[PDB]
Amino acid sequence: AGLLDGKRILVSGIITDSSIAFHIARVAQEQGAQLVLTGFDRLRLIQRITDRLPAKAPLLELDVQNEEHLASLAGRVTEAIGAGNKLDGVVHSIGFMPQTGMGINPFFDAPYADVSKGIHISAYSYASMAKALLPIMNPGGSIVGMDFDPSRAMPAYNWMTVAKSALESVNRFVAREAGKYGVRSNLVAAGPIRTLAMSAIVGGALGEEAGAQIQLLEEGWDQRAPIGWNMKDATPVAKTVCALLSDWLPATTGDIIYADGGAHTQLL
Amino acid sequence: AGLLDGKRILVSGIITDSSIAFHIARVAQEQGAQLVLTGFDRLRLIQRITDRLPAKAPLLELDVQNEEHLASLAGRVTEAIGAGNKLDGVVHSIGFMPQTGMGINPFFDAPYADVSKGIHISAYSYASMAKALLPIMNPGGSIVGMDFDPSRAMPAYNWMTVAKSALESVNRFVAREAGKYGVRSNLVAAGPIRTLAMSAIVGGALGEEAGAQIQLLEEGWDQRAPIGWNMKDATPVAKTVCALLSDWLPATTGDIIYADGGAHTQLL
Amino acid sequence: AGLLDGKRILVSGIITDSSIAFHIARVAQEQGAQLVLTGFDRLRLIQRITDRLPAKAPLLELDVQNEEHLASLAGRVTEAIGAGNKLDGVVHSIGFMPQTGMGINPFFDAPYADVSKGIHISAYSYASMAKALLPIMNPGGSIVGMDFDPSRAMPAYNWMTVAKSALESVNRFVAREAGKYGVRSNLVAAGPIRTLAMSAIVGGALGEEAGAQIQLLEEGWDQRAPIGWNMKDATPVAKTVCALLSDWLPATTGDIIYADGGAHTQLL
Amino acid sequence: AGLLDGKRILVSGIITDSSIAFHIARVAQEQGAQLVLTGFDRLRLIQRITDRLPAKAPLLELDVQNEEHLASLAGRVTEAIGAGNKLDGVVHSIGFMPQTGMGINPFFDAPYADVSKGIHISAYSYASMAKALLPIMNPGGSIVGMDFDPSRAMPAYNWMTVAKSALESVNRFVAREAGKYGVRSNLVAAGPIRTLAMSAIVGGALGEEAGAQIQLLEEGWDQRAPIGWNMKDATPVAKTVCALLSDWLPATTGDIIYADGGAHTQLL
Ligand SMILES: NC(=O)c1ccc[n+]([C@@H]2O[C@H](COP(=O)([O-])OP(=O)(O)OC[C@H]3O[C@@H](n4cnc5c(N)ncnc54)[C@H](O)[C@@H]3O)[C@@H](O)[C@H]2O)c1
Ligand SMILES: NC(=O)c1ccc[n+]([C@@H]2O[C@H](COP(=O)([O-])OP(=O)(O)OC[C@H]3O[C@@H](n4cnc5c(N)ncnc54)[C@H](O)[C@@H]3O)[C@@H](O)[C@H]2O)c1
Ligand SMILES: NC(=O)c1ccc[n+]([C@@H]2O[C@H](COP(=O)([O-])OP(=O)(O)OC[C@H]3O[C@@H](n4cnc5c(N)ncnc54)[C@H](O)[C@@H]3O)[C@@H](O)[C@H]2O)c1
Ligand SMILES: NC(=O)c1ccc[n+]([C@@H]2O[C@H](COP(=O)([O-])OP(=O)(O)OC[C@H]3O[C@@H](n4cnc5c(N)ncnc54)[C@H](O)[C@@H]3O)[C@@H](O)[C@H]2O)c1
Ligand SMILES: O=C(NCc1cccnc1)NC1CCN(c2ncccn2)CC1
Ligand SMILES: O=C(NCc1cccnc1)NC1CCN(c2ncccn2)CC1
Ligand SMILES: O=C(NCc1cccnc1)NC1CCN(c2ncccn2)CC1
Ligand SMILES: O=C(NCc1cccnc1)NC1CCN(c2ncccn2)CC1
């Protein structure tokens, strides 16, 4: 009798046990959803990590920059869920920006080849995934992507902020296409989460200046948030994604839900 | 095993069977919530209307302009739910603007005494209700109010648009105070709903010009909405309010959720 | 050969030599404008203060809460500028909120009579002034009001923030009416300025807590602003108001121009 | 005694007599500015077109995708304005999106190679130009770029809307870097202008459906604008760019000024 009882949902973006997608997958399974998982490059690691989920789920390879992977995706998902069955939900939890684009060097020194790779994976792929999966989605379905509020500039995040501004625009166009299938498209703008990569940045992987800036930036959320913010807890973010995958927000599309403790609503 | 199983929720704003609050109350009861209702002026009518809800609920008198009604509210609610029990949710579904403020005459011709009455009932009362009820709310609780997107000016809505801009500001301050109690505060910005008063305006109760403008304004929503908009169906709005009252959006506060078919995200 | 050569402009809001309106008036006169000034309550003080402006200007009494003052305003201005002449510009630099509404006590403890007085003077009066003066304004004319960004909640500003949210909504409706006369209506959202009242608040006139919060709040602007922010210098704000009064922003109306050093565009 | 008397300004983006940059260049020269022009690919055509400007100006070749052109730009500008002299202003009026990205085919059918080329020219190049020219800019200087409001999705504009969302984000980061030189960075969001390319689209160059959608979209501006909108008149847009290049908006940076007749402030 869970929130997502009987729903078939595809979850992308698991790489480690600290991935936001790992927590989305765990909460969705606790709420009765039947999952299909997609992974990039390190498939042996991803299978070993996902063995720790409450229930066993099939794992499919998906590199969003690979045209062949995207062209065969719908057929591979149909084989995993069985003929005559369709998806009720899709979770995009994919992001990447080369070090040159995220504070290892000044904003002006990031080459366009690096920025373009980052925009392909972080923004264009949201449209790529919707194109591939909408023909195998049921009416009343839901597509959810992960965002980080880019309305104002900030230190070190640099070109990844630009990629998120592009993603928010892409989401509004995806909602127009998804609407024809009776499917909603929305993003969850989360507060900062201490994943393995974020902890490494704070530890100085992109230089001391960038590390100090990210640490101070992350600390501002708990101070501003009227209900506080715990960067070591991904469960409130996972619950918000599940709310959008459910039948309980049926009139919301092309939109952004903020799971940030209310920090974006307060100046100080 | 409903979305709101075991929750004690106060619902204000029922006047007829077409009130948005009537639909919020019905959905909340179908989802296992135990309600307390508040009504203004026509208590015999409200009792007769609420006899049609799935379950019987106690009805309390509340005029938000009456200081005595607000001062005794917490004690009257405690008597209705029993000593030692507290509320888990509060629904503000209250609004009013005199005819002079809503298109019966030009924008510049509305006297301040009329505008002030409208702002008292539609915006200040959101803070009044939170002040009265937060001392009897449990941690993890939720306060929800009804909004109509006022970010851009529009024909005929006139000073009620100004009252909604004030309400959105009030909501951000209420979230600061509610946070100290472990309580969230949010608004649902709904698309237009054909209540008795809205149908009367379309029928020309505020003059032909205002009626023609409101009819054309309301018709724009379904055209712009990627998933469409049915002004004769309040159920998607009621479901969204219940989503905010639940434990499934635990990191959202001082915010606005749009239940408008995605119309605010599209230009044409 | 100044920016405003030959223009007839009404400037409201002068009380002391630290008033934002005093600096707007000085810059407008240096740029060739012919002024008419309006003052409230302390007319002997205002005449003595305005004797320090580069040129002598007629001073008229205007209490925005007084219906008689507003009804006679157009006739009194016509007498001052001469029959057959009209205004090219209007500056609204009026604001007030009782101490109960600005941090001397908690947000929930401000009585509605006090909040209503504050909203009348700070927001409704923008519509009152436009109603009185549009019949004596030339096509190509400009109305400008003073704003303080209220999109996010902040400590101590409390109900004055709510009044500014209402003012921004009022400005969008005033633009609809002013457009029929070929007149623009806009607001300037300024960064914090150390006027006599603001210095007194920092000095603890509204209590130590409010003073400490306002001081820290004000200090954040210079840190966030890419070009910095000097709270002791009103000249950049006065120049921005003159830009809107000129013929150089002819396609901007119902809008907000930010003269805050770019602080609102940066998170940290 | 013009608005820009004695200022040295670089203007990019002239291709025909209908280019927005042609009108910016003409108004800047009428206001006393000394110009340097940059052109792409068709240099013989651009020289012939710019012979019609009020004053003769040097023309330099600049393809924003060419690393060599950008590396030599500052030296070539210094040679044109003379040693010991620096620029006071820079105008970015550059945009491009392949037909696949602007309605000749569905949104999902635009290949990433085409979208990436469009984002390089329309958004990344704003950062490229600032990097090349800031070392030869005077304190008090100004950088201005051209925008088209992308906050909401719209028919046919498709991936060019996504490119504008990226440009707005880039502008906020450019303001951080430019601030170190005492230079402002802002965008002008203009209403639709009937350039040669826009007239060809309305005439069906990108298919009948796209043409019909663009014509209806463009027609909405004049209806919504409180002061109206003339798509055949670029002079109000050129005046707004000159206002930002002047000393009259000295506290505005990382921002957007809307020269759209106030259309973005009104729903209907
Ligand atoms: N961590 C935070 O503070 C935070 C906050 C808000 C939003 N987000 C967003 O949440 C999402 C998930 O990030 P995360 O923080 O969990 O980090 P993560 O490293 O755990 O997840 C990112 C995922 O992207 C995948 N990926 C990269 N390139 C790919 C490609 N070519 N094809 C397919 N998959 C590819 C990686 O394999 C990985 O699984 C991202 O969109 C991120 O921007 C993160
Ligand atoms: N109908 C729409 O199109 C629409 C759309 C979005 C939001 N809303 C908002 O939803 C809310 C509910 O409105 P509705 O459309 O259901 O209409 P409604 O007439 O059914 O409800 C408004 C309620 O306000 C109550 N009220 C008025 N003055 C009061 C006072 N002094 N004290 C206490 N209660 C008082 C009335 O008794 C009534 O129950 C309002 O805030 C309205 O602005 C309506
Ligand atoms: N000082 C700041 O930090 C700051 C920043 C942004 C915006 N503002 C705004 O600028 C405007 C001017 O304020 P200021 O800071 O120069 O302070 P101020 O005290 O010098 O000016 C406010 C003016 O309002 C007038 N006023 C009050 N009640 C009135 C009434 N009933 N009728 C007519 N006039 C009345 C006062 O006489 C005074 O001249 C206000 O709208 C204020 O909110 C101030
Ligand atoms: N026309 C409108 O309705 C409208 C409205 C708002 C904003 N804009 C924006 O105004 C700007 C100017 O466009 P326009 O409408 O005057 O059209 P336009 O065709 O006259 O100008 C665009 C310019 O971009 C140049 N360009 C293209 N690729 C280039 C490259 N690789 N290197 C250098 N220059 C390159 C072209 O040569 C041309 O001069 C664009 O950013 C456009 O998006 C246009
Ligand atoms: O989006 C975020 N974090 C949000 C944030 C911003 C500021 C402060 N705290 C948190 N992280 C993603 C994670 C995936 N990516 C990545 N991972 C590995 C290598 C390269 N890139 C891109 C960045
Ligand atoms: O907020 C709305 N409607 C939203 C809307 C706007 C534009 C087009 N369609 C819908 N209605 C409320 C209802 C309660 N009020 C009221 N009721 C009775 C008498 C006076 N006022 C105030 C107005
Ligand atoms: O709007 C402002 N200041 C903006 C601000 C906000 C936060 C930090 N720094 C600056 N001041 C006005 C001034 C006129 N008013 C007033 N004056 C006298 C007595 C009562 N009220 C109302 C408030
Ligand atoms: O940005 C605009 N127009 C704004 C607009 C949007 C919707 C309705 N009316 C106007 N035009 C530019 C012009 C330069 N570009 C271009 N030119 C030639 C070939 C390819 N691309 C890119 C598009």
User: DSSP readout, A173-236?
Assistant: HHHHHHGGGT-EEEEEEEPP---HHHHHHHTTTT-HHHHHHHHHHHHHHHHH-TT---TT--HH
Q: Which residues contact A107 (CB under 8 A, 6 or more apart)?
A: A158, A159, D127, D173, D176, D177
D→B interface, C-beta within 8 Å: 152-155, 213, 216-217, 220, 264-268
**CB spacing of B154 vs D264 below 8 angstroms:** no
Distance A220 CA to ligand 1 centre (A): 22
| Pairing, β D255-259 against β B137-147 | unpaired
Amino acid symbol at C217: L
- At residue D82's C-alpha, the angle toward residues D81 and D85, to 5°, is 80
Interface test with chain A among B227, B247, B257, by most A beta carbons within 10 Å: B227
CB atoms within 10 A of CB C251: 26
Cα A81 to chain centroid distance, Å, stands at 22
Tokens representing A179? Answer: 């609407």
Secondary structure (3-state) at B150: coil
Burial of D114 (0-12, 13-18, 19+ CB in 10 A): middle
Question: What's the sign of the alpha-carbon dihedral C7, C8, C9, C14?
Answer: positive
Tokens representing B174? Answer: 């209420």
Nearest Cα residue to D146 out of D251, D257, D69: D257
Question: What's the sign of the alpha-carbon dihedral A31, A36, A42, A48?
Answer: positive
**CB spacing of B217 vs D267 below 8 angstroms:** yes
| Pairing, β C59-61 against β A255-259 | unpaired
A22, A143, A146, best to mutate for ligand 1 pocket (most atoms within 8 Å of CB): A146
Partners of residue A130 on adjacent β-strands: none
C→A interface, C-beta within 8 Å: 152-155, 213, 216-217, 220, 264-268
Query: D120-159 b/e with 16+ CB inside 10 Å = b?
Result: bbbbbbbbbbbbbbbebbeeebbbbbbbbbbbbbbbbbbb
Tokens representing A187? Answer: 């993003």
Per DSSP, chain A holds a count of helices (H) and strands (E) of 9, 7
For residues B12 and B122, give the distance between their C-alpha atoms in angstroms, rounded to a whole number.
Answer: 13
DSSP secondary-structure letter at B266? Answer: B
> Which secondary-structure segment (H or E) carries D17?
none
Burial of B51 (0-12, 13-18, 19+ CB in 10 A): exposed
Q: How distant, in Å, are the alpha carbons of A61, A163, C93, D161 from that of A97? A: 21, 9, 47, 22
For residues B253 and B177, give the distance between their C-alpha atoms in angstroms, rounded to a whole number.
Answer: 11
For residues A111 and C33, give the distance between their C-alpha atoms in angstroms, rounded to a whole number.
Answer: 50
A→B interface, C-beta within 8 Å: 1, 3, 172, 175-176, 178-179, 182, 184, 191, 225-229, 236-237, 239-240, 242-243, 246-255, 257-262, 265-266
For residues B187 and B199, give the distance between their C-alpha atoms in angstroms, rounded to a whole number.
Answer: 24
Tokens representing B79? Answer: 């008597």
Distance C133 CA to ligand 2 centre (A): 35
Q: Alpha-carbon Rg of chain C, whole angstroms? A: 18
Q: Tokens 């599940």 identify what position?
A: A242
Amino acid symbol at C254: G
Pairs of CB atoms within 8 A across B/D: 34
DSSP secondary-structure letter at A136? Answer: G
3-state SS record for D59-110: EEECCCCCHHHHHHHHHHHHHHHCCCCCEEEEEECCCCCCHHHCCCCCHHHC
Q: Which residues contact A13 (CB under 8 A, 6 or more apart)?
A: A19, A20, A21, A38, A91, A92, A93, A94, A146
Distance B150 CA to ligand 4 centre (A): 34
- The answer to whether C193 and C237 are in contact (CB under 8 A) is yes
For the domain with range C1-268, which CATH number is right: 3.10.180.10, 3.40.50.720, 1.50.10.10, 3.40.640.10? 3.40.50.720
- The answer to whether B50 and B36 are in contact (CB under 8 A) is no
Secondary structure (3-state) at B224: helix
Whats the size of chain A, residue-wise?
268
Q: How distant, in Å, are the alpha carbons of B130, D122, D265 from that of B170? A: 11, 40, 22
Q: How distant, in Å, are the alpha carbons of A139, B109, B189, C241, D125 from that of C138? A: 57, 22, 39, 18, 43
| Method for structure elucidation | X-ray
DSSP secondary-structure letter at D152? Answer: S
Nearest Cα residue to D20 out of D260, D233, D264: D233
- At residue D182's C-alpha, the angle toward residues D178 and D188, to 5°, is 55
For residues C73 and C33, give the distance between their C-alpha atoms in angstroms, rounded to a whole number.
Answer: 20
- The answer to whether C31 and C2 are in contact (CB under 8 A) is yes
Q: How distant, in Å, are the alpha carbons of A135, B42, C26, C178, C252 from that of C137? A: 60, 48, 22, 9, 18
Tokens representing B151? Answer: 């970010």
D240 in ligand 4 pocket by Cβ < 6 Å? no
Secondary structure (3-state) at D119: helix
| Pairing, β C59-61 against β B184-190 | unpaired
- For residue C140, the distance in angstroms to the closest alpha carbon of chain D comes to 10
DSSP secondary-structure letter at B80? Answer: H
- The answer to whether C253 and C186 are in contact (CB under 8 A) is yes
Query: C152-172 b/e with 16+ CB inside 10 Å = b?
Result: bbbbbbbbbbbbbbbbbbbbb
- The answer to whether A160 and A115 are in contact (CB under 8 A) is no
Tokens representing A65? Answer: 């920059």
CB atoms within 10 A of CB D213: 19
